[PDB]
């Protein structure tokens with residue numbers, strides 16, 4: 001609200017948020033596999049919608 | 050509740066471990082001072098062991114890779130332009146010559162003068 | 177030591193040079209990934225060697241034979257060191273080889289015929305009624321003038 | 326339903342539209358799987374022939390980088406609309422157990438933060454192409470009337 | 477006919493479409509945040525635009 005603005009044009013740079021983990025952690029590779037699994041199944045686009 | 054809550058729920062579903070939704074103390078993302086060289090926020094919680102994993106929109110930079118690791122980005126984004134929605138503005142005096150033309154009216158007036166010259170040349174040269 | 181860099185002929189990433197018969201070494205090609213690997217070798221400081229894959233395949237695991245082909249299979253069986261190519265980061269490829277962070281994100285768009293301003297002149301004037309009602313209008317005009325005279 | 330649309334006959338695009346969960350894209354995959362005739366093509370150039378010989382009656386779906394590259398090539402008669410449908414991205418590959426992948430990723434982040442990658446994009450996409458400038462607003466905002474009727 | 481065409485649809489359009497539209501004009505201004513990585517991006521840029 002109040003639905004009064006709009007965004008035009010494409011993106012200007014290559015930005016991206018990802019899951020952070022400390023170095024030397026054993027869970028980073030299964031977390032990355034879970035991120036890839038959620039990306040390929042389109043559930044992230046469903047949550048985006 | 051929100052996006053990252055369901056994201057952590059999907060992480061715990063597809064990985065099978067208990068989680069603990071905690072809040073950062075200072076409310077900062079992460080920054081390294083030039084003097085103390087001490088990271089703050091969620092970055093400082095991950096470096097100094099105050100946190101275990103951070104599920105939050107943190108910007109993946111080179112200076113943050115030097116202390117901790119990062120996964121692949123789930124949602125890409127970029128720098129955008131914010132303007133207001135163009136509503137109806139008062140057009141005013143420009144409304145009179147607004148439709149069909151901006152320059153062709155002068156051609157209409159010049160052809161009017163030319164046809165008037167032709168009419169005077171025909172009508173006032175018969176004797 | 178030396179290092180093997182593999183890629184595939186794709187535009188504009190790997191393109192044939194004009195004097196390809198008159199060139200030698202890694203400078204026989206040109207494009208995006210060539211200068212990308214040049215910047216990587218500049219910021220790291222190692223010698224490389226540009227290679228071309230044989231089968232023309234990117235990477236795929238045949239489930240009957242449980243075998244990978246292309247540059248993925250070249251990296252698994254040790255035929256290459258670092259693959260510098262636009263290879264799609266999928267779930268099935270993470271389990272066999274590692275990947276860096278994505279440098280250029282992309283998506284799926286729509287390609288259309290891109291119509292231009294094809295607006296003709298006099299032929300657009302007699303559009304809205306017909307090109308044949310006007311002749312009947314002129315014929316009825318001259319007929320009514322004959323009636324009046 | 327007038328202007329048709331198609332994808333490539335084999336590849337991860339067909340696996341994406343086939344295994345989609347959105348009902349809109351599900352109806353798209355149902356229409357492209359039940360079209361008469363087949364909207365699928367074998368190569369990219371076959372899709373270019375199928376688009377250019379339809380005069381605005383057929384569209385082709387592809388990657389955004391390839392679409393922006395073809396848009397910047399001759400005869401400069403294509404254009405790309407809409408946002409990205411998926412969060413796809415390419416990265417530098419290395420085998421598992423290699424000691425070089427993390428310094429390669431450090432170099433990738435260094436080239437991304439210094440903006441040299443966007444400079445290479447502007448070099449090999451905008452400057453190398455045979456089309457005009459990125460602003461195609463030459464008589465693309467005609468407010469009132471074409472002057473050809475008046476002429 | 478054309479005045480009825482204007483009074484029929486009333487399709488309001490945007491004056492700014494691309495990122496080059498900001499450099500193309502000077503009447504409408506534009507800004508970023510006073511401190512942050514956005515200022516580091518626009519400060520250390522190499523593109524003349």
Ligand SMILES: O=c1[nH]c2cc(C(F)(F)F)c(N3CCOCC3)cc2n(CP(=O)(O)O)c1=O
Pocket residue numbers: 186234235262263264333335336337338369387388390391
């Ligand atoms: O790993 C893959 N990487 C790919 C990379 C690219 C490119 F964009 F050139 F980098 C392409 N193209 C896009 C469309 O025009 C033809 C070439 C296809 C790829 N495919 C086949 P997919 O299965 O259809 O995605 C892969 O499998």
Ligand SMILES: O=c1[nH]c2cc(C(F)(F)F)c(N3CCOCC3)cc2n(CP(=O)(O)O)c1=O
Pocket residue numbers: 078079106107108509511512513514
């Ligand atoms: O690591 C960082 N992550 C950030 C993440 C976000 C958000 F998008 F909310 F996730 C934002 N915002 C963008 C606009 O809405 C307000 C907050 C700022 C961030 N900043 C500050 P920057 O340096 O100016 O980018 C960081 O430093």
